[PDB]
Amino acid sequence: AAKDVKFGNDARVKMLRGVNVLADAVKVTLGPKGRNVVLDKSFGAPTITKDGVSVAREIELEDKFENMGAQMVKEVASKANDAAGDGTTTATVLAQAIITEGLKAVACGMNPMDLKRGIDKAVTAAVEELKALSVPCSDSKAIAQVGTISANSDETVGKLIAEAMDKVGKEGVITVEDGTGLQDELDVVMQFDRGYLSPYFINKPETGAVELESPFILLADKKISNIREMLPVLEAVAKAGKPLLIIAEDVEGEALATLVVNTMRGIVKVAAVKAPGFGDRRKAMLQDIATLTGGTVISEEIGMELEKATLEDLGQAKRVVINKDTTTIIDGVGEEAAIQGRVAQIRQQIEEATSDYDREKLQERVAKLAVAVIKVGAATEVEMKEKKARVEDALHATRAAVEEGVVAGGGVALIRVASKLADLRGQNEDQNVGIKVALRAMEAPLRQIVLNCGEEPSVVANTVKGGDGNYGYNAATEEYGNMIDMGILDPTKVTRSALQYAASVAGLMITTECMVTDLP
């Protein structure tokens, strides 16, 4: 289509106006005295949220150029989220603060492409300075604090996540789901998403689930349809007394029908459940189970018949629990040598994972061998969703603090790094201004946090910069102090991520001399 083409200052002013709308909608949620944003949503009720990326993703403006502005800087907030899990508002606030200052310089005749070089240099330095300030965070008290600050000063959420990480370990997974109840709730477990195939197996109608006591476990790679194949193994289990779980690709009617009438009567106690997964991942996961239980995968492809299996090839467990949705193996017989060998193998499979998706499902399996769910409580569903948004953010920050340490919150970390880089220069004057642009932007987080409390950001900024180390402003309590002593901890990873991403995008945005878009 025919295009509208704008140049120079006109293009930039539009680009900014756009940035500001997105920025201005997100910035209002920053900090403990941050407020919430309402996002209308076509199919049913609107959403109240503090989560900066959530606000950002919805912004789209009418004016084709302004929109372009907002649509580019939206990526800062968005990428922060995909890497860190928190800091999305901070990231957005920095980005604005750069873009704004940079463009002002561009208008003064300075060469954008150098302003960029400055900014980028100042940031590469700031990243390293932050790694210096970073003190690690591994005790449950520190983690609970990060969690708490991350969930907008909700101590329960901190406490609860800290408890969770303590229980699953570090090679273990934590999810968050909507609770039925009014208060928060933590559940801890190997399990996979498969129910009984035969609802006539439930041996405890109390729970509506099958509870096989100290059973054998048959791992069939192929899908079963004839009871002939089972007879040899079913026989040895019938003369052993112990029950049996059958985890094959599928238990077809002809061979299912029978199995039912056999437990129906009490001849053998057997359960049938599909195999966890699809394709090569199934055989991989099915193998994981064999290792935990000390059984052999009866793979039809690698020269085994299901009839030539014996008690030998069956896994064993202390207990088994299966319901309409999930199957759980409690404490398998498999030796911990074989297990941790199998784990350090899958651990290096995640190293060569060049795609995120290949990494997801792999660490899921290592957690099954080395898992927890937090259920979020609230009165209504508008409440549920702002709370659940905070819990996720908190969990992310906690995992990030663990893996990269913490720094003083209240945006002081950045303010310090800015004073430490006060001597940084570039190859020429424009690059210098570029550095100074970035350093001045580093104050923005603190400044906005203070501004959302309705106090004079210049005055607070000055007072924090007059101090040392972890002296900062506690926006919640409205007085100064030692941020680490007051539990106001941001993960290093998030503060770093915010800064890097804002800089990346904002840097480029300053180099805009022409804009091309469709006509209205």
Ligand X SMILES: Nc1ncnc2c1ncn2[C@@H]1O[C@H](COP(=O)(O)OP(=O)(O)O)[C@@H](O)[C@H]1O
52 binds, among Mg ion, K ion, a second copy, none (CB under 5 to 8 A by kind): K ion
Residue with tokens 């195999």: 275
Question: 26: closest CA among 91, 86, 101?
Answer: 91
Q: C-beta of 24: minimal distance to Mg ion in Å?
A: 18
Is there binding between residue 92 and K ion (CB under 5 A)?
Answer: no
Is there binding between residue 313 and ligand X (CB under 6 A)?
Answer: no
Question: Binders of ligand BEF among 53-82, rule CB under 6 A?
Answer: 53
Q: C-beta of 300: minimal distance to a second copy in Å?
A: 8
DSSP H or E segment with residue 83 = helix 64-83
Is there binding between residue 16 and ligand X (CB under 6 A)?
Answer: no
Q: Among 14, 54, 72, 86, indicate the residue that binds Mg ion (CB under 5 A).
A: 86
87 marked among binding-site residues: yes
Asked if 453 and 475 count as a contact pair (C-beta separation under 8 A), the reply is yes
321 binds, among Mg ion, K ion, a second copy, none (CB under 5 to 8 A by kind): none
Is there binding between residue 81 and ligand X (CB under 6 A)?
Answer: no
Q: Among 27, 69, 86, 271, indicate the residue that binds ligand X (CB under 6 A).
A: 86
Angle in degrees, 0-180, between the axes of helices 381-404 and 492-509, rounded to the nearest 10:
100
Q: How far is CA 19 from CA 16, 49, 61, 165, 292, in A?
A: 5, 20, 10, 38, 54
> How many residues make contact with ligand X (CB under 6 A)?
23
Is there binding between residue 29 and ligand X (CB under 6 A)?
Answer: yes
Q: Among 393, 430, 443, 490, indicate the residue that binds ligand BEF (CB under 6 A).
A: 393
92 marked among binding-site residues: no
Asked if 513 and 4 count as a contact pair (C-beta separation under 8 A), the reply is no
Q: Among 47, 49, 67, 88, indicate the residue that binds ligand BEF (CB under 6 A).
A: 88
Question: 218: closest CA among 152, 119, 289, 168?
Answer: 289
Pick between residue 296 and residue 474 the one whose CB is nearest to ligand X: 474
Contact segment (CB under 6 A) with ligand X among 292-300, 335-343, 409-417, 463-471 equals: 409-417
449 binds, among Mg ion, ligand X, K ion, none (CB under 5 to 8 A by kind): ligand X
Contact segment (CB under 5 A) with Mg ion among 144-152, 234-242, 244-252, 410-418 equals: 144-152
DSSP H or E segment with residue 516 = strand 514-518
Question: 300: closest CA among 239, 249, 259, 251?
Answer: 249
Is there binding between residue 490 and Mg ion (CB under 5 A)?
Answer: no
Within 8 A by CB and 6+ apart from 386, the residues are 36, 48, 49, 50
Asked if 219 and 298 count as a contact pair (C-beta separation under 8 A), the reply is yes
CA distance 158 to 137: 14
Alpha helices in 200-355 (DSSP H): 231-238, 253-265, 280-293, 336-349
390 binds, among a second copy, Mg ion, K ion, none (CB under 5 to 8 A by kind): none
Q: 485 φ, ψ to 5°?
A: -65, -35
474 marked among binding-site residues: yes
Question: 19: closest CA among 48, 82, 81, 61?
Answer: 61
Q: C-beta of 249: minimal distance to a second copy in Å?
A: 14
- Which parts of this chain interact with ligand BEF (CB under 6 A)? 51-53, 86-89, 393
Query: What residues are designated binding site?
Result: 29-32, 50, 86-90, 410, 474-476, 490
Binding site for ligand X (CB under 6 A): 29-32, 34, 52, 86-90, 149, 153, 409-411, 449, 473-476, 488, 490
